[PDB]
């Protein structure tokens, strides 16, 4: 998208967009969340049988 | 003895002076860029993490190299040449440098994501007020299939 | 302050002259004698030089033509 | 492109009966004494390529291909060609200071070239 | 102490030779906050002493 | 330290030959990115007879890129650097932009002074470390000049060590070469 | 120990009658930067105003209906009536039918100019150009309410009471003598009408002084 | 498995995840997160050691450059590489600047001072004035062939 | 407005000496939280309180130096003493001493809690002194005030004074420093369902809890209105 824009636009509107996917993209990463915990990975346990 | 005309005549000069930064080790001509300083209560510069990247650094440890442009072409070449602004793609093979590779595109992605469909997946709007309901409450990203007319 | 500096390079186009140009603008606005075209916005010479380069106003040859019919009207 | 330089020749062709000449200056003296002055002054030259070290020895200004990795034997060897530098490469300009011919300089250094051209 | 341990800190201080340790005592009597007087019962308490 | 810009143009007809890296399995680069920031020379000529396909000194601004797509084309003669007759520096006409110049490349500058550090830019490389043949999808057999000879099968022997084949599918795009040597018998 | 400061530059700037953005003056540590979201929160989730909420048209009641020349199908006509702030002074909600001629031009002005029920904008369109010249009736209604409500639950095509359209608020630094730490607020908006920036600050403001009497008593 | 029992014994999720509230807007954040207690420790290398800063300072006894193993006004030399990258920027007046002003020789300090205060930012290309020294040299100036144009 | 229903707090607990729970009656959503933001921003931080500004000892200077029999040493008693929390009347700069003689515990009774000084958790560990001849006396200036700051600001203007034996003290001044603004759903049945709100605030014992949510909402309307222009 971002190739796209500096070919079809130009580079005023392209710092714009950056700082305010930059901006954006803090804000919705606040927003979600999505932690990380162990059950976050599980193992599948064919392989107990498999190796 | 530091008064606070010393301080806002600091700040005056430094509103039309920019300076110019750059990283240790040495490897890339986007290892140093110039930038419209602003003043900082803090012991370490903070970069923009737009071109994190394009200092090759990590936020690890690292003392960055600050550059005054004491002459007025000087000043001219960097706010031309040596700006960041000036810099966008990767000068080597032409790819675009300034590129999101931290989780700002984690954002983007999950804003543009839907496990299957969330509450009020089926609703269907305009715009907007999109971000009034998610904000509160309506629907939300993970919703899927909600009707929209985009101009 | 001036974020991108692109109307300029357009009006010049070999992205060097125009550093000189707002130069030799800026050196002249600075020392006097001079009067900012461009209504300013309580910034340095400089930029009021660039943004007047970039409005299509100042460059290599209006100067030029200026400093002769001051010269010559010495 | 820059691999290769100080070409090897074979016929002097009225211009010289040696070897390891630029290839470019070669060039540009058969251009300017066959087309202009003597066509039959035709010297056969075999252009070759090297490594990196030795070609470093080959530079025109006599300040510079001195630092490079020793100069006191060039040193004596500038001292025995009496050259001059002759402010060549960005370097020299850098080493003397003198407007690097690249980007504001160049011009200015052009334009002193202006100034040069009148004197 | 940082909740989480693994067991070795205790001893690894008692062999860091950084803090102080009782050899031979039975009961501290007199404690300044420089100063520590410990009365050795006398099956520590060896003779002569 | 040696490269300058200083001659806008070579006026050379002296060029090089770009093709698409058609490596190993198949085409390991497209000849659609190879050039695009290149100018080159009056070898753009459309794929039919008597028919351009552009003029002798272009640039490929984008849609040169399209329209020679259109016409399989995967080689041309460009201007490139060395043949920029002008001995010292080279053409413009034989630099390009090759940067955020979306101009091509200024006066005064030195893309060698851009590069010599390119080539050492990625310096987290590592160091310190004709019987099976199979194609790849239709395609013709295009052996270049493989010398044939009578075999002891019904079939041509290669003479020549040197043969190589080149899969031709519909048009001038290839797949793979599959050379094969002397010892090499005409299956198909 | 207690002497509070505000925010006292008030100084806003619009870019038009639709576009602006007001500034707050630095003032102390977590006062520009709460009140801001504060702020923002409540011109979102509740604001006072009125609109229209549904129309009542002659034929078929489905919403997968045909244009028939219309040209303008039942989201089209329903969205061009809805976003308009219709208006009634101290009434409740008021109904307004329309006929006219083919012309084609829709705007907001053909609807019955009651005593109460107004449009800002009377270039509004409320429907798209026809390819015939039929009469039918509108039969639209103008609503006011508190904040916002859809028209998903309370059928049928939109209810507008909140009149903001887009809101976001920033916090810059300020100094005082040595010690910068001052987070002004700012908000910048862009909009529908109807509601002067000042105007509708004073507002707000009122409301939340007139409310926070009882919990300080 | 006996970490989820414990939190179950101690009353917490056997997962850990938990809704959380914003400190700023106050929105319930989805996605309920873990948390905990991690035990942290600081870094021998302190950032008040790291600071340092340098304008013009004191010189050394050797080539008339700052230094005397003294931890006043230290300022890293320009790089090789460095210096390599900054003429590839063609910033030939910044660098003609680094290798006029950025160093040792304070005979022109006093021009670079009163120009800048004159506001004149003006400098001189004059020589590298220690290859003028270097002329000096010269096999005593024995090497002059110096045809200056 | 409009049917605005403007509660009155009601039901306003407080367990303890050191804290309280308010109740109040319900109010609408989308608002309730930020109020309950403002309150506690308004009643913790802007909080008018008391703590320790000036230390003194005639045998124990600004060193860290342990005094005779005491424990603890001049950092490390006031690490222990700021543990607690002490009074000071409608004025400010107040002074607490604690002063004891003696091998026993240490603690607040042996200390000036005046009338506009005064002590409620009156047993901590305050470094007994273990030596007989020792007899303990240092002096804290318990003073009045709203936000944190450290010792170095007080270098300006005492310079030629904190002299040699006058220390002078920090404090971080958030006198409530802890508010819990919680908004649900519930106390309204005849009209619109309503938010309630609830603040656990708690201090250390420096000002009254319904007068902080008092001087928190006054500020809530104060900078309420100051939007208008």
């Known amino acids: 998208m971002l190739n796209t824009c500096y070919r079809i636009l130009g580079l005023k509107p392209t710092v714009i967009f950056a700082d305010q996917i930059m901006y954006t993209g803090f804000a919705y990463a606040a927003r979600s969340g999505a932690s990380v915990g162990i059950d976050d990975m599980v193992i599948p346990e064919k392989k107990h049988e498999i190796i | 003895r530091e008064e606070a005309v010393v301080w806002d005549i600091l700040d005056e000069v430094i509103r039309e002076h920019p300076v110019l930064l750059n990283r240790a080790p040495t490897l890339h001509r986007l290892g140093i860029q110039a930038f419209e300083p602003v003043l900082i209560e803090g012991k370490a510069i903070q970069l923009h993490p737009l071109v994190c990247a394009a200092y090759n650094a990590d936020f690890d440890g690292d003392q960055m190299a600050v550059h005054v442009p004491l002459t007025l072409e000087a000043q001219l070449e960097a706010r031309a040449l040596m700006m960041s602004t000036n810099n966008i793609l990767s000068p080597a093979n032409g790819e675009p440098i300034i590129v999101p590779s931290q989780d700002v595109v984690l954002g983007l992605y999950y804003m543009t994501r839907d496990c299957v469909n969330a509450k009020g997946e089926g609703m269907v709007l305009t715009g907007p007020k999109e971000a009034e309901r998610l904000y509160r409450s309506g629907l939300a990203s993970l919703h899927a299939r909600v009707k929209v007319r985009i101009t | ?74 | 492109r820059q691999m290769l330089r100080k070409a090897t020749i074979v016929n002097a062709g009225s211009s010289d009966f040696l070897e390891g000449e630029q290839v470019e200056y070669s060039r540009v003296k058969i251009a300017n004494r066959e087309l202009e002055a003597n066509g039959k002054v035709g010297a056969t030259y075999s252009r070759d390529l090297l490594g990196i070290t030795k070609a470093s020895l080959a530079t025109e200004s006599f300040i510079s291909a001195a630092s490079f990795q020793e100069t006191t034997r060039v040193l004596t060897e500038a001292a025995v060609a009496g050259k001059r530098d002759e402010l060549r490469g960005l370097k020299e300009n850098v080493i003397v200071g003198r407007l690097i011919p690249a980007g504001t300089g160049y011009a200015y250094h052009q334009d002193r070239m202006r100034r040069r051209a009148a004197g | 102490k940082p909740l989480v341990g693994t067991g070795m800190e205790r001893a690894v201080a008692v062999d860091s030779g950084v803090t102080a340790v009782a050899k031979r005592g039975g009961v501290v009597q007199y404690v300044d906050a420089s100063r520590i007087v410990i009365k050795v019962n006398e099956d520590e308490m060896y003779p002569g002493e | 330290q040696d490269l300058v810009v200083t001659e806008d143009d070579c006026g050379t007809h002296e060029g090089i030959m770009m093709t698409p890296v058609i490596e190993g399995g198949d085409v390991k680069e497209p000849l659609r990115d190879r050039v695009l920031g290149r100018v080159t020379a009056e070898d753009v000529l459309k794929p039919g007879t008597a028919d351009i396909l552009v003029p002798r000194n272009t640039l490929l601004h984008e849609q040169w890129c399209d329209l020679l797509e259109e016409n399989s084309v995967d080689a041309v003669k460009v201007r490139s650097v060395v043949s920029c007759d002008t001995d010292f520096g080279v053409c413009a006409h034989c630099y390009g932009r090759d940067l955020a110049r979306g101009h091509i490349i200024n006066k005064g500058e030195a893309i060698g002074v851009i590069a010599a550090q390119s080539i050492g830019e990625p310096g987290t490389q590592l160091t310190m470390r004709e019987s099976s043949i199979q194609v790849k999808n239709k395609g013709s057999i295009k052996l270049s000049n493989v010398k044939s000879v009578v075999n002891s099968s019904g079939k041509l022997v290669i003479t020549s060590r040197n043969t190589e084949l080149k899969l031709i599918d519909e048009f001038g795009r290839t797949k793979e070469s599959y050379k094969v040597p002397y010892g090499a018998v005409l299956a198909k | 120990v207690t002497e509070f400061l505000k925010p006292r530059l008030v100084d806003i700037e619009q870019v038009s009658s639709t576009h602006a953005k007001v500034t707050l003056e630095p003032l102390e540590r977590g006062f520009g930067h709460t009140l801001g979201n504060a702020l923002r929160r409540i011109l979102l989730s509740s604001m006072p105003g009125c609109a229209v909420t549904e129309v009542e048209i002659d034929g078929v009641l489905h919403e997968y209906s045909t244009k028939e020349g219309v040209q303008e199908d039942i989201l089209e006509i329903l969205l061009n009536l809805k976003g308009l702030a219709v208006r009634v002074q101290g009434k409740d909600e008021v109904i307004l039918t329309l006929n006219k001629s083919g012309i084609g031009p829709v705007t907001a002005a053909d609807i019955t100019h009651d005593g109460d029920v107004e449009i800002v904008k009377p270039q509004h369109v409320i429907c798209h150009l026809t390819d015939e010249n039929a009469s039918i009736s509108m039969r639209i209604k103008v609503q006011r309410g508190r904040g916002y409500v859809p028209a998903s639950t309370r059928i049928l095509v939109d209810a507008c009471y909140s009149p903001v359209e887009r809101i976001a608020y920033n916090v810059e630094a300020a100094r005082v003598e040595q010690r910068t730490d001052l987070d002004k607020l700012v908000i910048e908006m862009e909009t529908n009408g109807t509601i002067d920036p000042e105007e509708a600050i004073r507002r707000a403001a009122t409301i939340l002084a007139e409310q926070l009497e009882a919990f300080v008593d | 498995a006996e970490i989820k029992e414990l939190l179950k014994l101690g009353d917490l999720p056997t997962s850990g995840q938990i809704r959380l509230y914003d400190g700023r807007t106050g929105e319930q954040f989805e996605r309920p997160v873990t948390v905990g207690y991690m035990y942290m420790l600081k870094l021998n290398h302190l950032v008040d050691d790291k600071m340092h800063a340098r304008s013009t300072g004191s010189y050394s006894l050797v080539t008339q450059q700052p230094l005397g193993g003294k931890a006043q006004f230290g300022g890293q030399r320009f790089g090789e590489m460095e210096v390599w990258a900054l003429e590839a920027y063609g910033a030939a007046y910044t660098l003609q600047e680094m290798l006029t002003v950025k160093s040792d020789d304070v005979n022109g300090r006093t021009k670079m001072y009163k120009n800048i205060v004159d506001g004149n930012h003006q400098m001189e290309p004059g020589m590298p004035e220690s290859f003028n020294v270097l002329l000096k040299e010269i096999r005593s100036l024995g090497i002059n062939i110096e045809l200056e144009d």
């Open chain 3, 1 to 74: 302050a001036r974020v991108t500096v692109q109307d300029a390079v357009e009006k010049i186009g070999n992205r060097f002259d125009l550093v000189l140009v707002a130069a030799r603008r800026a050196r002249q606005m600075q020392v006097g004698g001079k009067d900012p075209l461009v209504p300013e916005e309580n910034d340095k010479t400089t930029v009021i030089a660039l943004r007047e380069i970039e409005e299509g106003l100042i460059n290599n040859q209006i100067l030029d033509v200026r400093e002769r019919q001051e010269q010559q009207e010495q």
